[PDB]
Amino acid sequence: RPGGDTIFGKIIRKEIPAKIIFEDDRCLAFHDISPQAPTHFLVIPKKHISQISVAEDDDESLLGHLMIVGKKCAADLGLNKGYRMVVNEGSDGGQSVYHVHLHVLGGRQMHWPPG
Amino acid sequence: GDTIFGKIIRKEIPAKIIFEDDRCLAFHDISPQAPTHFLVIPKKHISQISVAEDDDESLLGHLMIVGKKCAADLGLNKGYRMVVNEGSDGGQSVYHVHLHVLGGRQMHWPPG
Numbered sequence: 001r002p003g004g005d006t007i008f009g010k011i012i013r014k015e016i017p018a019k020i021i022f023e024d025d026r027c028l029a030f031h032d033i034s035p036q037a038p039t040h041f042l043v044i045p046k047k048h049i050s051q052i053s054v055a056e057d058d059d060e061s062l063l064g065h066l067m068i069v070g071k072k073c074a075a076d077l078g079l080n081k082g083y084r085m086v087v088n089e090g091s092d093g094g095q096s097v098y099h100v101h102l103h104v105l106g107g108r109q110m111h112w113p114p115g
Numbered sequence: 116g117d118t119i120f121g122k123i124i125r126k127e128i129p130a131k132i133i134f135e136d137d138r139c140l141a142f143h144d145i146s147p148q149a150p151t152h153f154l155v156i157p158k159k160h161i162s163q164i165s166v167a168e169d170d171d172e173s174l175l176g177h178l179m180i181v182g183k184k185c186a187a188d189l190g191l192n193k194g195y196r197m198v199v200n201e202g203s204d205g206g207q208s209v210y211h212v213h214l215h216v217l218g219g220r221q222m223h224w225p226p227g
């Protein structure tokens with residue numbers, strides 16, 4: 001089972017259902033099960049990386065691709081007033097799934113500080 | 116149009132610089148929202164993430180790798196939050212794309 005057995009690894013392999021927005025060879029975008037904004041989705045690599053603090057230098061293009069796919073999906077979902085992208089790292093970040101992912105939140109005014 | 120982050124990149128006004136290379140700059144946020152709060156910005160003037168090009172992919176990823184290395188160097192061993200704001204709903208404050216890195220306290224949910 002390539003990609004590991006976190007819930008996101010299993011979503012990648014279609015073993016657990018998700019509401020998928022976009023998929024390519026490098027990543028997957030799907031709606032968050034506990035949305036914190038009217039639109040709230042995740043962009044995740046298909047390659048398993050546990051957290052950003054252990055990403056390798058050669059992962060740069062992949063991490064950037066998450067953001068490019070994030071902004072394209074946001075446009076496709078009509079978030080024309082904007083949105084916020086978030087990565088939660090470790091305990092102080094509140095990370096709860098150790099498979100790297102980018103949150104994209106919009107459809108309402110986001111506030112400052114960002115948590 | 117130029118921004119205050121352009122002035123910072125050009126060293127025209129001061130900032131507490133953490134790291135620099137040929138394509139990005141990391142510096143402490145002047146209005147910190149956590150005990151550690153810094154920015155990583157590209158030297159290329161991309162005004163907002165919504166207009167970033169496909170060719171910008173590795174540059175954007177570079178901001179994140181530089182961010183995580185700076186976070187480690189600044190002792191954020193318990194973790195942190197990375198943020199990119201887009202547009203008015205995103206609360207984007209400067210139209211030069213920038214990665215926020217916040218830590219040194221528990222970050223909360225929702226993220227604004």
Ligand SMILES: O=c1ccn([C@@H]2O[C@H](COP(=O)(O)O)[C@@H](O)[C@H]2O)c(=O)[nH]1
Nearest residue numbers: 007031032033034088093094095096097
């Ligand atoms: O089956 C799952 C499990 C988690 N999540 C979402 O993944 C995120 C995990 O938390 P964090 O690691 O991003 O803090 C949360 O927003 C949570 O709702 C899902 O969408 N589906």
